[PDB]
């Protein structure tokens, strides 16, 4: 079985769903209304725990306001979130439900290796 599982830590978490037919992963949404102060930063939690498939990694990718920027493995049991950095002079309100990142499953593979003349 190759199954990605999420588990809500509180009633405030939202289910992760794909944004586009062609998106690389599913979007993570803010559990709370969070103000990121001007020139400040905030951790924005989803109130989701995640168990990625065995042997794989989940990368928290970007969906003004810089997101940091994280990768998890199958042992991770924390509450998924991002750190948002507000470079502007106006506070930024993240509302409950807002898309804050996408979560992409990835795995390392080992292809055959060769050198070539050109290409």
Applying CB under 8 A, the residues found at the interface with a second copy are 1-8, 15-16, 24-26, 49, 51, 53, 56, 77, 104-119
As a whole number of angstroms, the distance between CA 18 and CA 39 comes to: 31
CB nearer a second copy, residue 32 or residue 56:
56
Judging by DSSP bridges, how do beta strands 57-61 and 70-73 pair with one another? antiparallel
Taking the complex as a whole, the smallest distance from the CB of residue 4 to a second copy amounts, in Å, to 4
- Dihedral of CA atoms 30, 34, 39, 41 in degrees, nearest 10, equals -60
Taking the complex as a whole, the smallest distance from the CB of residue 71 to a second copy amounts, in Å, to 10
CB nearer a second copy, residue 53 or residue 98:
53
Q: List CB contacts of 114: < 8 A, sequence separation 6 or more.
A: none
As a whole number of angstroms, the distance between CA 15 and CA 87 comes to: 29
Taking the complex as a whole, the smallest distance from the CB of residue 89 to a second copy amounts, in Å, to 28
CB nearer a second copy, residue 26 or residue 44:
26
């Amino acid at each position: 079985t190759c199954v990605l599982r999420f588990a809500k830590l509180t009633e405030n978490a939202l289910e992760p769903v794909r944004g586009s037919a062609k998106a690389a992963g599913v979007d993570l949404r803010s559990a709370y209304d969070v103000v990121v102060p001007a020139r400040g930063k905030a951790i924005v939690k989803t109130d989701l725990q995640v168990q990625v498939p065995e042997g794989s990694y989940g990368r928290v990718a970007p969906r003004f306001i810089d997101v940091g920027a994280g990768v998890v493995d199958e042992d991770y049991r924390g509450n998924l979130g991002v750190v948002l950095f507000n470079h502007s002079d106006v506070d930024f309100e993240v509302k409950h439900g807002d898309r804050i990142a996408q979560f992409i499953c990835e795995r390392i593979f080992y292809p055959q290796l060769v050198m070539v003349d050109k290409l």
